[PDB]
Amino acid sequence: QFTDIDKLAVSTIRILAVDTVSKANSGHPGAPLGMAPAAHVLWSQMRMNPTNPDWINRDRFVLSNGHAVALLYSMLHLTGYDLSIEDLKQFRQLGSRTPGHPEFELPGVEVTTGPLGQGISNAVGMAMAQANLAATYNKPGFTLSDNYTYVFLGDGCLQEGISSEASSLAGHLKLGNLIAIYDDNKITIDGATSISFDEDVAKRYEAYGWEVLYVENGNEDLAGIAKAIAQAKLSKDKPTLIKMTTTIGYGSLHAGSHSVHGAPLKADDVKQLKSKFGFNPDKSFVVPQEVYDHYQKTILKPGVEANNKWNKLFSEYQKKFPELGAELARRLSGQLPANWESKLPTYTAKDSAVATRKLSETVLEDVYNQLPELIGGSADLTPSNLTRWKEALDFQPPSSGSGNYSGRYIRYGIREHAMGAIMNGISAFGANYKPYGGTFLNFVSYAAGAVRLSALSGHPVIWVATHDSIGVGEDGPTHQPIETLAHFRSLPNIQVWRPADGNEVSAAYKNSLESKHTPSIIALSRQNLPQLEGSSIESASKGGYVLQDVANPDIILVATGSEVSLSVEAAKTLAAKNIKARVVSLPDFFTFDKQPLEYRLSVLPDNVPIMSVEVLATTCWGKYAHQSFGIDRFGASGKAPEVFKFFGFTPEGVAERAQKTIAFYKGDKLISPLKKAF
Amino acid sequence: QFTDIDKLAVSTIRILAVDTVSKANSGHPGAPLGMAPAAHVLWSQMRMNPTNPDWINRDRFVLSNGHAVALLYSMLHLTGYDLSIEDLKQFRQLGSRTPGHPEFELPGVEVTTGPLGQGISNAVGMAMAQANLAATYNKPGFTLSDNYTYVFLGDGCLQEGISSEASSLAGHLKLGNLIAIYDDNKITIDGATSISFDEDVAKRYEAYGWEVLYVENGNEDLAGIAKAIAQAKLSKDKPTLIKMTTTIGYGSLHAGSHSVHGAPLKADDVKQLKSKFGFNPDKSFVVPQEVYDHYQKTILKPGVEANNKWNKLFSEYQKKFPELGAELARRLSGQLPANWESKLPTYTAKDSAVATRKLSETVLEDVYNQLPELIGGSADLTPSNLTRWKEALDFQPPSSGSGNYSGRYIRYGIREHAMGAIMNGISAFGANYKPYGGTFLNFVSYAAGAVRLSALSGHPVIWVATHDSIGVGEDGPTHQPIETLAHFRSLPNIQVWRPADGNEVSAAYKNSLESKHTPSIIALSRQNLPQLEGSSIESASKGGYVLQDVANPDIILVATGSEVSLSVEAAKTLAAKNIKARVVSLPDFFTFDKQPLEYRLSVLPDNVPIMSVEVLATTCWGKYAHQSFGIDRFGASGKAPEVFKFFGFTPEGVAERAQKTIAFYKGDKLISPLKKAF
Numbered sequence A, B: 001q002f003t004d005i006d007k008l009a010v011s012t013i014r015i016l017a018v019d020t021v022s023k024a025n026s027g028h029p030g031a032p033l034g035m036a037p038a039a040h041v042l043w044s045q046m047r048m049n050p051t052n053p054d055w056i057n058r059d060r061f062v063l064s065n066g067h068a069v070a071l072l073y074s075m076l077h078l079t080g081y082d083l084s085i086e087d088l089k090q091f092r093q094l095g096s097r098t099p100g101h102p103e104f105e106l107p108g109v110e111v112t113t114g115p116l117g118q119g120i121s122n123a124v125g126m127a128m129a130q131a132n133l134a135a136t137y138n139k140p141g142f143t144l145s146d147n148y149t150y151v152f153l154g155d156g157c158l159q160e161g162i163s164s165e166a167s168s169l170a171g172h173l174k175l176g177n178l179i180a181i182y183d184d185n186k187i188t189i190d191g192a193t194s195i196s197f198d199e200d201v202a203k204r205y206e207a208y209g210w211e212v213l214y215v216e217n218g219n220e221d222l223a224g225i226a227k228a229i230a231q232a233k234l235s236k237d238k239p240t241l242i243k244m245t246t247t248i249g250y251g252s253l254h255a256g257s258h259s260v261h262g263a264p265l266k267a268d269d270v271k272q273l274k275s276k277f278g279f280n281p282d283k284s285f286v287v288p289q290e291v292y293d294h295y296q297k298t299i300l301k302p303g304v305e306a307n308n309k310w311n312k313l314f315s316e317y318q319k320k321f322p323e324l325g326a327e328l329a330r331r332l333s334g335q336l337p338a339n340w341e342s343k344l345p346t347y348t349a350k351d352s353a354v355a356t357r358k359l360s361e362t363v364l365e366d367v368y369n370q371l372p373e374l375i376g377g378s379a380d381l382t383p384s385n386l387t388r389w390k391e392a393l394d395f396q397p398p399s400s401g402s403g404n405y406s407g408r409y410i411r412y413g414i415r416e417h418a419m420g421a422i423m424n425g426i427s428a429f430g431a432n433y434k435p436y437g438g439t440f441l442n443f444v445s446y447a448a449g450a451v452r453l454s455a456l457s458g459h460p461v462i463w464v465a466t467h468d469s470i471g472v473g474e475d476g477p478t479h480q481p482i483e484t485l486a487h488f489r490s491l492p493n494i495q496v497w498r499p500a501d502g503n504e505v506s507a508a509y510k511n512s513l514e515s516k517h518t519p520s521i522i523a524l525s526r527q528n529l530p531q532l533e534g535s536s537i538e539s540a541s542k543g544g545y546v547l548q549d550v551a552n553p554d555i556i557l558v559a560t561g562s563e564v565s566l567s568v569e570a571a572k573t574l575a576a577k578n579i580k581a582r583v584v585s586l587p588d589f590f591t592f593d594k595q596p597l598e599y600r601l602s603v604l605p606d607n608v609p610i611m612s613v614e615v616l617a618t619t620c621w622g623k624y625a626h627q628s629f630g631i632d633r634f635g636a637s638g639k640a641p642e643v644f645k646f647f648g649f650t651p652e653g654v655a656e657r658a659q660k661t662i663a664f665y666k667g668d669k670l671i672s673p674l675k676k677a678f
């Protein structure tokens, strides 16, 4: 039952968003105006604490149509979050807390959106995390977890393939606490949706197993919107999509036109809009006191009290369940178990040779019990990635018969992109969730859109990327990575691990799991590799180190993964020719670059030629080596050993190129590629 | 009406594919065994010429579930293509004509598949190309174009978001000559589809506007498969999907199990399989003469005659329609109009400043009439990319009211990945089709899966990627490319143009359009840039050149796009300090690298420090410069000019770093980064 104060709040939201966009003379007024009614109704019935944006059991909201951020900033301010009118007055300005698209860093913003399709996919992950948390910690009389996951999205998100992947999986998973509101306004940047998007959205979502509800007049029907949301909560066995029809830019002289999608409304348009809603056309950023009072009473105080009651319930829970209570308390503090790394496998040169793919499997087997927050999965490559521990229980709806929500292994299906965004959502949920997902390194590229946000937002997600090179063999070039590592090494804030042996694999996992703000891609091989003499978790955790040292080397061979052992063998060939080669292992560029310059230079000093060895593109190696031996063309379908030889990657081949490099620089003064002039 | 010979052909296909996989001791026997009946029926009614795989009006077949390639190689051999049993006996071996996944290079293989979801998307493009060719050249009594586009796909392709994008668009486009057969075998690598994929596929496709037919017993129902295909052809207004249920690995002792998906069948399993079908369990690669005879009579001879009648029809067409006939003849020869480049815009330092985004629009406007094979489009960013010429007619179904199939502008919607694969399909169709698609550079990354195949297969598609950097301004970091260029510059066989001004933009388009085997990404800016003194189409067409020369320079400033003008201004600042700077423009790494070493060294010689300037990652610049001034962190939301200054990109900022570089190397012997030791 909504009254005049509710209508006033809606007008306030609409005008505040418009003023925000107008002052910036940049931004999108359309969707904010169209979705204001829904924002008011939804937020007014959400259980959250504006004074504690991190409350674990808060209902969560995701703006998948991120360009409509002026609406989110308006809601954040109006409902009590730490965002002021001045912040809104700095919308889209260098260094403000109000960037042109929602950023994870801001309190109240659950994830970074802007790239269409990501938000809704993130929400699927949030709902999955909630389901697991509840199934793992809830007890009779102690409902610690039961929040809802709300999402706003438009035609753009519905067209991006990632949302189809995520929605198909969400339907299979029967995520009944996931509720999405679709802004059905029939407009996109190119004009009417009919010119490129006339599918039956409702029918498609029902096909995924979603319940689809409708709100014919999303422009004014507050009760209808409220009723749809209420109904969505009743279908606990199906995620729900609410097709809410609205007029983009409602209120504007050009409402319903693509022109109001992403350009500020003209001054006179804003004036008539305000007058129309009973506001002074000559005033801006106006918030009637009655509106603040209303939200204080309907959202803020009730939210603070809900959080209060929850803290009381959790306090008692820890007394009732000391172990589970301490476990969750630890997770909420964002810390892994003390000395958890002690369970990471260690090796010596005496141990047998193992593929890093298998070594990875062993690490997972040795730490999954120690890390209850660890949630794994694979994009339909479980037997190939070796990402599922022996007695794992799959994350599935109870009715499946293949597992339940307390399960910790996700069957993502052939959906890399959605897996990437879902992991971001699981990570964003909190409670120290540590999601990891497996697939072939070459197909991690299918999820670049999501991986980029993992890096930008700082979601510590982990990609277990096996079959890292031509070592794949027979499957051929369409399956053999060449540009993949160079790509992500060029992406800020992402670890790109390529472990050479057992100890390096443990270091990769150690650093990846302890990471709080940096995602990780761990590139693994399927071919067997020997346990290197000189490797250790401690040294490899530095991203780069001297594996095999020698006094006054004639050359330094810097390599990664499978090529480190190759370089060690090449060193033997060189030694047989009275040539000294120091071998450097560079497990991770990112981690290495984080070390002090002093250390990095001790690894890659001046006065000695440095040649890199890695069976992938050489484009990214200029930062560490003078010359590079790699592959800058596509692969080949053939037995792995034969393919390596085809490309010249044999001990002799490396040694020969080392000799050429030595002769090439004889008599020259060499400077470490690490030294910069500014 | 199929008889015993047809059943024998199916058994021959099944066993040949199995033997092929077994000899390689690598590969996938599952789908080939399951889809053999459909392959026989489909191919037996396809109008194609095995003796001329390039016949423009041939019905086309795409194996979207590429891992099932043993089936395709079997069909190619059995039906008369230039592929021998020996070729099959070299399946998955280094250098053979039969790699582990289908490659575009092989005659009879329409596109490269293996990465799931690409094939079906490519097919959508092929059908679109056919529709346009027919609408453009067909005349009363002269039906030059009317072929069908057939596709085989499995659960894997249906799960990848790219196929949803492509299928949604295909439905909107009412592509009635597109017919897809879905291998509904309920199995994927992780096991039963029910664990991650239980959506209602039929309902979803009907929601897109596709007609969905069924074949309950795809293991034996030859007539049913034939009837489904016949029915599909009757619905000229809807693409058709045939849900054909089969048993994966039909015939194997382990049929129906995930174990037969991608591992050769054991020796004894193969033996019982052969005995079961009436073949000798001790013989391999057996083709009964009656089978060759049957295909000679039902496919090869009829195909040769159909191609013959078509050649006769086209010869008469050329006499009837001299102009249109010569036009199509030219296109079929794969050549652009003689001296077509004469229509490319040219500029001088006297012309006004223009954003390369706008310059691009002008090129398109000046050549679309000259190039009838040019087909453009945008992923819902037409007004932003400026990719649509003034009097263009959109490619749409006749019933749309927005255009028809003769239209040359595609409204791709927010579907970058599908746009990438669809352009590949349009390019692959032939008739010299030149598709180009626009979107923001940062979202080209959403289509990496397809772009990679553009490079691997060698489809000369063109991406008009606007808003190339922080110059984007207010939209912020989620929209500002940092790693994008570095990523694709690390990918073999792809041009990554970043034109600095008017002449460079024309050079970019000249090289991109004349390209026969290399795709292109043209990175464009939105900010205005001046017409450079020293630029020209001829010079820029070399990928790299000396824009502003000077005798005995103290430093060389090498830059791209918007940073070239910045470096020119920086040179003025340096000159004011009695410092000489030569300015080099590097529009395209790929094209530059193609030039003779002699030329490249003349542009980037020894004995002089070289500093690169580009507002993106520096990770890829080690190949050309000693020091690099770029951005290796994410962007910021703010007015463009302010963002540039924040990152220090002003004439003074570049000049200062140039001075640091000069001092850093004073007294040292410098070698061009271009010189290699091997």
Ligand SMILES: CC1=C(CCOP(=O)(O)OP(=O)(O)O)S/C(=C(/O)CO)N1Cc1cnc(C)nc1N
Pocket: A030, A031, A065, A066, A067, A068, A114, A115, A116, A117, A154, A155, A156, A157, A160, A183, A185, A187, A188, A189, A248, A261, B379, B380, B381, B414, B443, B446
């Ligand atoms: C294509 C596109 C938009 C479409 C707007 O349609 P919508 O239906 O989602 O909403 P409205 O109803 O509000 O128009 S908003 C937008 C941006 O770049 C803006 O962020 N873009 C470019 C864009 C392209 N591709 C991706 C992955 N993300 C994007 N943001």
Ligand SMILES: CC1=C(CCOP(=O)(O)OP(=O)(O)O)S/C(=C(/O)CO)N1Cc1cnc(C)nc1N
Pocket: A379, A380, A381, A414, A443, A446, B030, B031, B065, B066, B067, B068, B114, B115, B116, B117, B154, B155, B156, B157, B160, B183, B185, B187, B188, B189, B248, B261
């Ligand atoms: C996941 C996967 C396959 C699933 C097979 O399921 P399917 O239902 O399409 O067919 P079957 O019925 O024949 O099993 S086959 C396959 C490969 O790597 C093989 O090419 N892969 C790994 C893979 C992952 N992701 C992408 C984009 N492409 C791939 N090829």
Ligand SMILES: [Ca+2]
Pocket: A154, A155, A156, A183, A184, A185, A186, A187, A188
């Ligand atoms: Ca819309």
Ligand SMILES: [Ca+2]
Pocket: B153, B154, B155, B156, B183, B184, B185, B186, B187
């Ligand atoms: Ca299948």
